[model samples]
Target: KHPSGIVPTLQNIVSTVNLDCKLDLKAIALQARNAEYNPKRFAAVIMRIREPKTTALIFASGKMVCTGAKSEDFSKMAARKYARIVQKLGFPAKFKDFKIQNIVGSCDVKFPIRLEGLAYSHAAFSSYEPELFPGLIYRMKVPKIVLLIFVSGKIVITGAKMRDETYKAFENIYPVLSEFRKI
Candidate 1:
């Protein structure tokens, strides 16, 4: 809306998300202030990719919000990058703990794999990895709650919803999610 109309770039997709989607900016800010810290918990990672010039935030809550990308490949790349990040962070050895990585690729779904993004508040919860602290993002499904998103570039906050109908909201937008395999 201002003088900058450069569009979403791989490095700045977070900015575009705000412009494209309407998130609870106020609430998100509040949450950020009281963000649930989990040292071992990996939160979201924003990544940049070539080609479509897209950027994506792979949250730990099994939700991936990608912006500035024109194709599905960016999503895949986000997954790959996420895996690498997980490896660097150290993989959890349990099934429940295995959920640590937001995005993972299995033998069945290599290409077009579904990437993960963690969602959590520092004040509200704790992570298995105590050292990671505040950065821990989880795939937890919460209810009767609120969501907020803030952005500096293209996609700041694209979506917001009440917890009572969280999963339902995601269902209606299956098409957006189906692009990734084994979601």
Candidate 2:
């Protein structure tokens, strides 16, 4: 039970993706760390970045639950690649038929909902748009790692098997967060 925020694991994420891409793992680590501390003052709120550890590497038991979903560079490209790979293997479904949840990264911020407070939470999310929700009780299983970007410039990362995997998880999930300007 993490009380304050979610924890990220770059090294674990790195080991998961296991790709031969041209991503500077170190730079990604810096960006990820900065994601928490840095003020988001840019025109491009959402930026897509992919590297060896971006999605290939992960945090926990090689599983995560994601809150927000957006079509970033890594996601877009990865979807294409995944489609090709699937096609080459003679699959039945078309690339467009794939569920976003499949390629989309997952986080470990699975908070338990207080059944006693279900009414309040339901009301809160009811007022929020499905796309941009705030103060929502988003709970999922701890796949491998967990990531938390606070209202303040603070990044909280946890549950990684390795240092590089910890860093990689950050690089992979940051772009999606770019869209999250508010709570």
Candidate 3:
């Protein structure tokens, strides 16, 4: 129960950090716990941490992408923790350019929506193909968040750099969703 009466809970926070030095993925995979690397499949070492419950994609280019953090602070903390792991593996790793790449949030509007009507009316911003996908995809330009809207009034908002942008995106679309409210 938020002040807005329709609060979107942050489900995931995607962040990236630069280690600022090349890394030996093979060595890291061998030294780090819960790390997996398959050179034939992917170019990055996949590492997992339990505290914040995040996964890190460690690349040889000194780049790391952390996902599954529920908050921005947790995202940053998780990135630092990943960098520390690299540092412990004998790499001169520096945590630089740590940025929140995307934030995913979801909320239930508590009322069903007419997806067909919405997509037809807001063709400029929405794309809906029930045959291909169940949800209508709405790409908001101002806040630059992509929303996966369902007929059941459940919406997932993603591609937001900041938490406020997620909130703003939800606020901006709430009224529009209401207009397409199914009776």
Candidate 4:
């Protein structure tokens, strides 16, 4: 029931796609032009697209991970492009399954927070150790989201599948943070 200030913005998206057909990295690298693969260092071939600004890791096991799309969930769009590219590279490339793995959202509360107090009271589901990390790690089980609340009032919400989950987590945390506002 609270809100505002540089609202939580989707920072990065991660999605996984299955092609359902075996793939060869050699042909992908030779055709993608945008792909780079060093089997010695990493088995997967990495490719990039500019429109959606997605970076993908294509594994020969017919599975691929789409990453780095910011500003809304265009993850499926980006991954679809990859599947088309794979098909163009001459594989059966059936679109079997596509799943959103994780979403990261960041925002600033425009105030300072008392990390110590918040951490102390919510100890059951939170952790705060300034020596190891400055931010308070608060885990919410309802939405399965983990939030990093900083003393500077900067918040990073992780393990989100959609905007509503992140929004819900932030709203619930907002009231708590307000109570711990620093003077």
TM-score: which candidate is best?
A: 3
Q: lDDT tens string, model 2, 16-101?
A: 12222233333333444212212244211122234311232211121212212233333435544433332343333233332223
lDDT of 3 by residue, 99-155 (tens): 999999999999999999999999999999999999999999988889999999999
lDDT of 3 at 124: 98
Clashing pairs in 4: none
Candidate 3 has an lDDT of 0.93
Model 1 is weakest, by summed lDDT over 10 consecutive residues, at 149-158
Clash pairs, candidate 3, are none
Candidates sorted by lDDT, best first: 3, 4, 2, 1
Give candidate 2 misplaced runs (Cα > 4 Å).
1-143
Residues 35-126, candidate 4: write the lDDT tens digits: 99999999999999997998999999999999998844588889999999999989999777788889899898989999999999999989
The better candidate by TM-score, 1 or 2, is 2
Give the range where candidate 4 is weakest over 10 consecutive residues by summed lDDT. 1-10
Most lDDT-accurate candidate: 3
Q: Which of 3 and 4 is ahead in TM-score?
A: 3
lDDT of 2 at 61: 23
Per-candidate clashes, comma-separated = 42, 40, 0, 0
